A paper describes a structure:
Here, the first crystal structure of an ANT(3′′)(9) adenyltransferase, AadA from Salmonella enterica, is presented. Trials to perform molecular replacement using search models with low sequence identity failed, and the structure was solved using SAD phasing with selenomethionine-substituted AadA crystals. The final model contains residues 3–262 and only lacks the first two N-terminal residues and the His tag. The loop regions 97–103 and 235–240 display weak density, indicating flexibility. The N-terminal domain (residues 3–157) forms a nucleotidyltransferase fold according to the SCOP database and has a central five-stranded mixed β-sheet surrounded by six α-helices. The C-terminal domain (residues 158–262) consists of five α-helices forming an up-and-down α-helical bundle. AadA crystallizes as a monomer and is a monomer in solution as confirmed by small-angle X-ray scattering, in contrast to structurally similar homodimeric adenylating enzymes such as kanamycin nucleotidyltransferase. In the AadA structure, several of the residues predicted to participate in ATP binding are involved in interactions with the C-terminal domain: Ser36 forms a hydrogen bond to Asp206, Ser46 hydrogen-bonds to the amino group of Lys43, and Asp47 and Asp49 form salt bridges with Lys205. Thus, in the conformation observed in the apo AadA structure the nucleotide-binding site is blocked by interdomain inter­actions.
Aminoglycoside resistance is commonly conferred by enzymatic modification of drugs by aminoglycoside-modifying enzymes such as aminoglycoside nucleo­tidyltransferases (ANTs). Still, the S. enterica genome contains an aadA gene encoding an ANT enzyme. AadA is an ANT(3′′)(9) streptomycin/spectinomycin adenyltransferase encoded by the aadA gene that adenylates the 3′′-hydroxyl group of the streptomycin glucosamine ring and the 9-hydroxyl group of the spectinomycin actinamine ring. AadA catalyses the magnesium-dependent transfer of adenosine monophosphate from ATP to the two chemically dissimilar drugs streptomycin and spectinomycin. AadA consists of a nucleotidyltransferase domain and an α-helical bundle domain.
Author numbering: 3 to 262
The structure:
Amino acid sequence: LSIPPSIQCQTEAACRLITRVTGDTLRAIHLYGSAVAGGLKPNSDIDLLVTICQPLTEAQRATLMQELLALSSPPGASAEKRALEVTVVLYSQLVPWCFPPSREMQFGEWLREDICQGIYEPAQQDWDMVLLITQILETSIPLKGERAERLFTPAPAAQLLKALRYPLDLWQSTADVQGDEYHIVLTLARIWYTLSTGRFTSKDAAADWLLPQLPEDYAATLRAAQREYLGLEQQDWHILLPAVVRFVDFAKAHIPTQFT
């Protein structure tokens, strides 16, 4: 399990930046995502988990967000510079597990304008953490420190069910769905996929797995989302809203209530 050469230099720069700002409290830095599974696409992001022992000073938070922003560019912006996603989490939140755990910090290109404004979102509870940790137990490269397998504990099956199904109650109505249709459709495919196959690294696999099992009506909707994810075509998701709403309902009806 190796790091693709093409991201080798960008990954090292973030690593040295993180180690620099974090200094002592740094426990581990894990690489995950398309870079280790599914293969890189022009639009893939480099994904890092940063495990730390104590919380960040506001100064450090500010330094990290600013400097990451600099080492990152929007996906499909430039060759030689890829979108970064960086999640900082307190060791004490994973070991022992707090449910849901808080994440200390998150960087991503969706924060670029907020960061330009000097707006830095604070620590908060994220059920996705449970998913994330479980995901990196399946596949990750330990860029700094111990391998995930040694460092992190599962995640009782019950909580995994809780964390996967949690987003389902986010979308009751059309208004819930209205501006998030692209994210929702892919998330629904991911949840269905993981619940069915038991496999938590879902981002590249889910759609391809599910599409053959979908009646054409819904497959058409999932297909557009995938194709947008792959970055080979972009869709106007506002016109696709009613087909997405239908997708949601059909998905809530058939998505497993338990692990197969």
